[PDB]
């Protein structure tokens, strides 16, 4: 899914530099993409995180959505961010709040399905009912039908 290239955007570059520096090691001799999934535990143990075999096996299943035991740099960066939210910096909560006043053109203190809709129309991106409600519930943590401001932060922190 799109969170792959999202992370490729979301991730910072000083990260991916040492990401490749450590990525250089997996080759057990003469490899060109034959990476295995039993080594997923070890490679998640390498890059600086502290993983546990439970999540190791889950990501063995949760990742390898291609099933080939392989992971793209896109998939690499996403399964970085989809667990460790090394996303596009989540610019702030308060720069976010000034963005949120423009979300609530109606000065709501909450992004409602209406404000969600109008703001995504201001993107030009059309309103499918899932879209806004996918955004609503992903932001409307209280499930009040609308995304209040901290709902918006936890919503759009780690977000460009």
């Amino acid at each position: 899914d799109d969170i792959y290239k999202a992370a490729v955007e979301q991730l910072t570059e000083e990260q991916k530099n040492e990401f490749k520096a450590a990525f250089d090691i997996f080759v057990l001799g003469a490899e060109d993409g034959c990476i295995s999934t039993k080594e997923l535990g070890k490679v998640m143990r390498m890059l600086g995180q502290n993983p546990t075999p439970e999540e190791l096996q889950e990501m063995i299943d949760e990742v390898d959505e291609d099933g080939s035991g392989t992971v793209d740099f896109d998939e690499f960066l996403v399964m970085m961010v989809r667990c460790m939210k090394d996303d596009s910096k989540g610019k702030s909560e308060e720069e976010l709040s000034d963005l949120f006043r423009m979300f609530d053109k109606n000065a709501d203190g909450y992004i409602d399905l209406d404000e969600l809709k109008i703001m995504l129309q201001a993107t030009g991106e059309t309103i499918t009912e899932d879209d806004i409600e996918e955004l609503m519930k992903d932001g409307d943590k209280n499930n009040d039908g609308r995304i209040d401001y901290d709902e918006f932060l936890e919503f759009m922190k780690g977000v460009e």
Partner: protein, 57 residues
């Protein structure tokens, strides 16, 4: 011959026992893996329980 035999019995003892100890290590590892999988099912079954129990609340 009895002492060398004892060495062989003890060495065979170790080969059988070491292999067995490894089989036991493997059965043990298997029970660890299985209880962990079951435990992880329980973590999720309990987590899911919590989600529905919380949602129930």
């Amino acid at each position: 011959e009895e002492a060398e035999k004892a060495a062989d019995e003890s060495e065979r003892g170790m080969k059988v026992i070491e292999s067995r100890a490894q089989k036991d290590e493997e059965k043990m590892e298997i029970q660890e893996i299985q209880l962990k999988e079951a435990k992880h099912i329980a973590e999720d079954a309990d987590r899911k329980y919590e989600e529905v129990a919380r949602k129930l609340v």
